[PDB]
Symmetry: C2
């Protein structure tokens, strides 16, 4: 099932917007509330199907959860009371739709000494091996991961492959373990660091933040408290790119600029004038078209692959030639940009984009986030109307990018 949005191109974007929290921060953070003694308020929560599922999962585990729904200008506020949690078995009927559900394994094991989570549909060894390094007995039977541990005990563990959710799950197991834990080859994404910041706010002792080596001094209990989820750096970048490629001027509020260095530096190369505070970013093109940019995606803190499709759209309308290097087949959106008249040639992992002033609106299809963000952005400058058919599960309502782009002067409408 597919609804349409219709973009009328041409206008420079002007105004201010705010973004909400990053998905890969909020999901483990919601699971971490199971570790706490008192209620925990999580603010800046985005609207995502996975957030809704996780809230439902916490409730079925026995937590009392309330949701103050977010708006265009602020994320949701979720209060989790973990005290009445009385289940260590995660229900398959909910878990089966959300791979992130593996993130309850660490907390439930630490809180209850036992935990059961279904194997995902479709990797998992880093979670099992890492928790075993803390002394858990873990077996897989009948498609369930079954874990038990009288008392988790600090130890040394090195990840074989870098894993964001692996790092998070083992970290949550370590904060209440007896003694000191050292994890090597940890994921370094800011979403991991935001989880660690949340745990510290609740009483955890973690050193080495932002690096591949985390040192955890186990404490007996975590308290309740409050945590504002790290702003979504990908959303922030998307609005900055949309401002840049329309020759406009936008200010993004409640941002976290020190998670965006590589992106902001690339926008400067495109001709943007950028100022940053401790919580805002202002981009001003001063009436200029963007210059085409070259980029290569690389692990954080280098240029993020999750911004590549958006910069490709920028290059499609920029002055000059831009070469994009993708280090997985990450160019599904190319043929859709070609329907708009873009000049893109793909050679292996490299896309060469020659920018043009003559993109023309046409019907296009978006079946994933990359196609969606890139096609909406291209639509902002294509002549006439771009009609984007988007798959149903991408719909985020008030946090669809087109809703905030409209508030910046774009002409975009949903046509069911």
């Amino acid at each position: 099932h597919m609804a349409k949005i219709v973009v009328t191109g041409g206008a420079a974007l002007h105004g201010e917007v705010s973004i909400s929290g990053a998905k890969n921060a909020v999901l483990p953070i919601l699971c971490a509330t199971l570790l706490a003694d008192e209620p925990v308020e999580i603010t800046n929560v985005p609207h995502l199907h996975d957030v809704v599922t996780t809230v439902k999962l916490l409730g079925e585990l026995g937590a009392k959860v309330t949701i103050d729904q977010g708006t265009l200008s602020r994320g949701s506020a979720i209060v989790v009371d973990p005290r009445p949690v009385n289940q260590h078995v995660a229900p398959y009927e909910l878990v089966k739709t959300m791979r992130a559900s593996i993130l309850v394994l660490g907390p439930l094991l630490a809180r209850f000494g036992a935990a059961e989570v279904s194997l995902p549909g479709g990797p998992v060894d880093q979670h099992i091996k890492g928790l075993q390094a803390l002394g858990a007995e873990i077996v897989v039977e009948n498609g369930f991961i079954k874990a038990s541990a009288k008392r988790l005990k600090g130890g040394h563990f090195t990840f074989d492959m870098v894993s964001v959710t692996g790092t998070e799950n083992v970290l949550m197991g370590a904060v209440l373990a007896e003694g000191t834990t050292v994890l090597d080859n940890c994921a370094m994404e800011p979403e991991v660091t935001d989880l660690a910041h949340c745990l510290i706010a609740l009483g955890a002792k973690i050193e080495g933040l932002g690096t591949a080596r985390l040192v955890i001094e186990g404490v007996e209990r975590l308290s309740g408290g409050r945590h504002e989820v790290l702003p979504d750096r990908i959303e922030t970048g998307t609005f900055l790119v949309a401002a840049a490629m329309t020759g406009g001027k936008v200010t993004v509020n409640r941002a976290r600029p020190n998670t965006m260095d590589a992106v902001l530096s690339k926008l400067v190369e495109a001709g943007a004038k950028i100022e940053t505070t401790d919580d805002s970013i202002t981009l001003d093109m001063q009436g200029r078209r963007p210059k085409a940019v070259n980029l290569t995606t690389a692990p954080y803190p280098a240029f993020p692959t999750d911004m590549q499709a958006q910069f490709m759209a920028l290059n499609c309308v920029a002055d000059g030639v831009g070469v994009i290097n993708e280090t997985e087949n990450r160019f599904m959106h190319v043929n859709e940009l070609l329907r708009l008249g873009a000049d893109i040639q793909v050679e292996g992992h490299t896309a060469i984009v020659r920018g043009s002033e003559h993109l023309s609106g046409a019907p296009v299809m978006a079946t994933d986030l990359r196609a969606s963000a890139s096609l909406i952005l291209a639509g902002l400058m294509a002549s006439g109307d771009t009609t984007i058919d988007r798959i149903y599960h991408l719909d985020r309502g008030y946090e669809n990018i087109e809703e905030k782009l409209s508030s910046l002067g774009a002409t975009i409408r949903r046509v069911p």
Copy 2:
């Protein structure tokens, strides 16, 4: 969206079923009707979303199409009148939902001297092959735009084997001026079935079933009739279901000489098998299946599209079976669901080791792809109690869901919306 299928396991299957046509035969064959001067009747047509889309596409190009809907025992009959066809540009709104839409490029180009098809959401063998026949082809604004006053016979070698590439270029060659030789062609029986159809309409093609097709171009294709090749994968699925429940089934309107590798593997599992010119009878004579070993390989060797079903068979068989999947890239998606039923499966790279068991127990499982669906339904036939399969909406083929024909063989399966 997810409907539920509930299987009660245990019963040996007995009876007869018939299967309808293979998808990868019917789709190019429907497109081939654009080449003809008179109406063409296509029989044994399966119910598939792509068939529905292709019928719509032909109508939007200007053909007049009628459908007599198939049943459990007979595929559909479609009559295509290509005479009023008046469009060489395939509409994006329809094309965008079906990658197989590229198969109108060759026919429209040959009939009209021009054709435009949207890029899909690879394609190079189709473009290069038609260029070898003298077509001018460019890609602009996301459309493949081809033109040729007159296609001309030539030589072309496919860089990699392409089923739909072979089909599209073949359709361009049959009305070309002069003689064409295509090398490194796909050898799947569905390709050969398209060639049989073209010959029935007047084409001259030699080398059927081989990597080299030799085509003497003719001036016109006539109208006529073609019965689509029976689906060998559906045939195998029902034979496997009979084998693993210890039953006895006859599959009617079969094409046994497209099934050699599958029948040989079922013999290895303990099946007693007879074949006529159009039927297959499998009899387990009250035995549990023996575990089998297999390595998927290009036709006519063991087909990857039968691998998940034989994995389910091995889950309930006597012994250990080694299954090596070297073709299907996203492999073994169904393994973790089979584990929820109690199966004993270990995976090492591209190889799964299955120790069969009499102790599979029904449980909730999820099927988001054809392999998961077929393997979980089959395993559900023998697991104790009830297996509850959540299946994604786009797999629903209604009366051609395998569970509908399995029910007619004594299975207890019900749809629970």
